[PDB]
Design a protein around this ligand. Sequence first.
Ligand SMILES: CC(C)C[C@H](N[C@H](CCNC(=O)OCc1ccccc1)C(=O)O)C(=O)N[C@@H](Cc1ccccc1)C(=O)NCCN1CCOCC1
Ligand SMILES: [Ca+2]
Ligand SMILES: [Zn+2]
Ligand SMILES: [Zn+2]
Length: 168
Amino acid sequence: VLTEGNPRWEQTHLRYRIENYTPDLPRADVDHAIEKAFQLWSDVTPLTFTKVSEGQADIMISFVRGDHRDNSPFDGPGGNLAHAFDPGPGIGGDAHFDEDERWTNNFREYNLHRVAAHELGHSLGLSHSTDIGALMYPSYTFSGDVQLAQDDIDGIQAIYGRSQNPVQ
Ligand SMILES: CC(C)C[C@H](N[C@H](CCNC(=O)OCc1ccccc1)C(=O)O)C(=O)N[C@@H](Cc1ccccc1)C(=O)NCCN1CCOCC1
Ligand SMILES: [Ca+2]
Ligand SMILES: [Zn+2]
Ligand SMILES: [Zn+2]
């Protein structure tokens, strides 16, 4: 079961920029994990996201460590892995990834795509789920696959509406 709060982007076409990259995995793997995480939400709602190299983007992603000037510092390896801000200007919608963690793209601890998809749901306005199988559950889990559970479909669609088009 979810628990939704309030703020939500009053525009269906957002833009995002990936400020920097983890030296842990190739640039293309980072770009693609982020892209694929956005693609999940886009599959069930009328939202659209566009990667931007520069200019004003709505969602700014960055890998940071410890105190990164936003009043909520990271803790090093383990524990807090990342965090995103709910819809709004400035840091609203932004997502920071704890650089102290090793970011992977497989079963090895801390699959970037699995954490990014979770965080980005926050940037859209999603609260957490109680359902241990949903994507918005409060702690990291990797079934080997990352697809929205009913809880996630329901929570996000309640805010933005459902898609018209099928999926794949
Ligand atoms: C679900 C995850 C993919 C993401 C999750 N990230 C955040 C955690 C809260 N971080 C955070 O910084 O919260 C306050 C905040 C929120 C927004 C902006 C600024 C500040 C979230 O999704 O709400 C996380 O780091 N969770 C940690 C656990 C944790 C939770 C909150 C705070 C600190 C640690 C985790 O799963 N880490 C995996 C290891 N463990 C640790 C022990 O329990 C079993 C899981
Ligand atoms: Ca950490
Ligand atoms: Zn931060
Ligand atoms: Zn969360």
